[PDB]
Design a protein around this nucleic acid. Structure first.
Lengths: 220, 150, 138
RNA sequence: AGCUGUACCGGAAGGUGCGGCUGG
RNA sequence: CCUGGUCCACCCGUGACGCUGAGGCGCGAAAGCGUGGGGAGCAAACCGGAUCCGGGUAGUCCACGCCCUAAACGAUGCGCGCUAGGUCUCUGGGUCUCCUGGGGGCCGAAGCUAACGCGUUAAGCGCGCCGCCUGGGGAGUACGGCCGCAAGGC
RNA sequence: UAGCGCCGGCCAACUCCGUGCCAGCAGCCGCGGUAAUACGGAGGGCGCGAGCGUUACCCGGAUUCACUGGGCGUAAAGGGCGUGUAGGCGGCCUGGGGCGUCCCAUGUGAAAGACCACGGCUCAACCGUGGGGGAGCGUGGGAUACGCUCAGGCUAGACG
């Protein structure tokens, strides 16, 4: 503790939203808000961090899934400062159960990217070039970061297990361990390694992700 | 390594703008007669495509049967929808006593001696699913001991 | 009103297991204590303890579950898959030594209230006595 | 709009009075 | 004015005095009947018009007796125990923005269902008692019995 | 001495010729109006065999009276409601009785039939010898966990 407290990690959602299954992590209630038990957060963090350290040491691959408005930039920067891929724009339905199909799009993006940097572009008059530019821009926006996955990942890291329930379902279906920075309105049972924290509060996500990536880098 | 046989072929129809469109459904069981079984249902415009898809599906939905002396460890009754299956162990030299669907499922699982029964609705698809569910819910002495004592 | 206390305990336990609670509370009785002792000895439940709820004596039962599973629906396997009441008020079931049922080829147990107290099927058969078939557990 | 209990039809491929229901 | 049921607080008294209920007894929308009154409006049957409108008796109303049916429905018998919550609303009590009872609805965990859906007001998990079903039509018809003045009901 | 049924699916076993909603088949689905492996004949093939088919009756499949082992919101099925008689069922803490319940011993449960073993007809049907098993009931002796009854206590149901 003493590092989490100032980051506002232990600030949950209102009484209106709380998931009953999460009740085992509530310390107390104050001022119409819920409070997460710092201690439990601590040992859960220790356990999950041990798991991530072991996986990194073994040379595994972790996918980062954060789509929430404030978390996009954080996920981007934190993921780039490591070899691990990420998804931060919008989780296309079927990145895991339909990995081959999305790999087709990865191949398509690769081929376009190669083509634009080739001296054979003098064909295909300006308008077709503009159409291809639009296509390339779209594929770059949506499929960037995902391009690193040559195959199925080894684990998944999700900022919000509820916002990204589809990704959770896919990972569960394909026996991929799940790491989540859950809050008062999440389902603990659907996550193997859970970090009870905050999904808003940029500070909290910054702290947690920075620590995680530093642990990743250190163990390589 | 895996041998294949068909549960049933059916042809379904859907209305369109003045006409009927036919799609074929196949129910396929796969096994090795060693204590592993799989079931799949494949829907396709054409029969070969349906068979291929059904086999393809069955190859992942995989179940290990805890065989012992080529018979089920214990009796079990299982309800799926409006269908009921009853399975009971048999002494060596009894044979598979089952309908078409249960016999087909159990033979590929390596089961040699069992007494079965179908109750309620006897729709092949639901019977097959009930059989698979019943197979999935089987335990041995070792498993029970491990869970209880630890 | 409450007609069958034993059935009440059975349903309470079943409802507790089906939602994965760590413990449950039940009204106190000697016969119920005996049933829970039999269950604990066979390693179906983590164990029972006599407590007091706002004046009235109760028993708190600590339940046992399986390890966390993988894939969709990671809810662990139950230890008490199925518990059923055999002898009910309005239709009592009494069986001799020769008619003692075998539950799940010995994988399960059955509780007999015999002249020599509450026993399982195995020990009841061993001591060579019959009685009232309370409930079956597997 | 349909259905329904009841009570009547000497211009009864059904009609009307008193209610009731959505199985509109 | 007389009177039934019910809820909450105090936790003061009795110490199982409880649940259900074949028959019986009572209640039972509307329509309908009898012995008397009453009759503004509306209105079966009926009197006329162009082929819906204008009148109009019983009836609708009151007192006392009968009749005892229905989409008499939440198409869900009664009592008790257990099983996540969120929201709206009616009515009580407290240490008053919340906590704790008793009703009426809406979304939904687990679970159940053939599905639609139900889901602490269960159609879930159970126990106790009563009623009812055994393919459609013939048909709630025929004969018999009981009730009723009759239509008719069981 | 070799016959009888069947050959569309259920259900084992396919091709010609005759007729064209006619003659017919049919246990259910249905087949027959120019192709019909479904009618009649022939070739062939399945099944049984000195037997093979048909009709009538009983059980099964029928979990389709559901004790084992069903149900009642919309498929058939909650009484139009209340009060309540008989009946059915019923909180927890100690005792007495031992009716229900359980156990032991013994009598009976004839013979034949069923099961097992051995044996005699050249084998088998058939028969013989021996051994048990057997629901239930009588007598004598034990146990009190549950139901029952008789005593006492409690407040969590109910009532005030």
């Amino acid at each position: 503790v003493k590092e989490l407290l100032e980051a506002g990690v232990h600030f949950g959602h209102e009484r209106k939203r709380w998931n009953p299954k999460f009740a085992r992590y509530i310390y107390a209630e104050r001022n119409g808000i819920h409070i997460i038990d710092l201690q439990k957060t601590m040992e859960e963090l220790e356990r999950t961090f041990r798991f991530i350290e072991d996986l990194a040491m073994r040379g595994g691959t972790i996918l980062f899934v954060g789509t929430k408005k404030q978390a996009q930039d954080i996920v981007r920067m934190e993921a780039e400062r490591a070899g691990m891929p990420y998804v931060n724009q919008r989780w296309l339905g079927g990145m895991l159960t339909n990995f081959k199909t999305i790999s087709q799009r990865v191949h398509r993006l690769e081929e376009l990217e190669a083509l634009f940097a080739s001296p054979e572009i003098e064909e295909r008059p300006k308008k077709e070039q503009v159409r291809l530019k639009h296509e390339l821009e779209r594929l770059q926006k949506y499929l960037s970061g995902f391009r690193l996955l040559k195959r199925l990942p080894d684990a998944i890291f999700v900022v919000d297990p509820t916002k990204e329930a589809i990704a959770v379902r896919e990972a569960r279906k394909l026996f991929i361990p799940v790491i989540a920075l859950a809050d008062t309105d999440s389902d603990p049972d659907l996550v193997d390694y859970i970090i009870p924290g905050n999904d808003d509060a940029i500070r909290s996500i910054q702290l947690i992700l920075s620590r995680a990536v530093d642990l990743i880098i250190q163990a390589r | 390594d895996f041998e294949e046989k068909m549960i049933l072929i059916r042809r379904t129809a859907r209305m369109q703008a003045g006409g009927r469109r036919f799609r074929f459904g196949a129910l396929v069981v796969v096994g090795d007669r060693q204590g592993r079984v799989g079931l799949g249902f494949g829907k396709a415009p054409e029969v070969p495509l349906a068979v291929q898809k059904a086999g393809y599906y069955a190859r992942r939905n995989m179940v290990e049967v805890p065989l012992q002396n080529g018979t089920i460890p214990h009796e079990i009754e299982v309800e799926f929808g409006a269908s009921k299956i009853v399975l009971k162990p048999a002494a060596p030299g009894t044979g598979v006593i089952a309908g078409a669907v249960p016999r087909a499922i159990l033979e590929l699982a390596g089961v040699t001696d069992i007494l079965t029964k179908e109750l309620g609705s006897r729709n092949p698809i639901n019977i097959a699913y009930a059989t698979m569910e019943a197979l999935r819910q089987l335990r041995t002495k070792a498993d029970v001991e491990r869970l209880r004592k630890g | 009103m409450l007609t069958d206390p034993i059935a009440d305990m059975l349903t309470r336990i079943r409802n507790a297991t089906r939602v994965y609670k760590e413990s449950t509370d039940v009204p106190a009785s000697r016969f119920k204590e005996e049933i829970l002792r039999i269950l604990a000895r066979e390693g179906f439940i983590k164990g029972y303890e006599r407590v007091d709820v706002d004046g009235k004596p109760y028993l708190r039962v600590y339940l046992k579950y399986g390890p966390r599973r993988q894939g969709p629906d990671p809810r662990p396997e139950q230890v008490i898959h199925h518990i059923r009441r055999i002898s009910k008020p309005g239709r009592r079931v009494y069986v001799g030594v020769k008619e003692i049922p075998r539950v799940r080829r010995g994988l399960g147990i059955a509780i007999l209230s015999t002249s020599k107290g509450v026993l399982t099927d195995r020990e009841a058969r061993k001591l060579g006595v019959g009685g009232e078939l309370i409930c079956e557990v597997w």
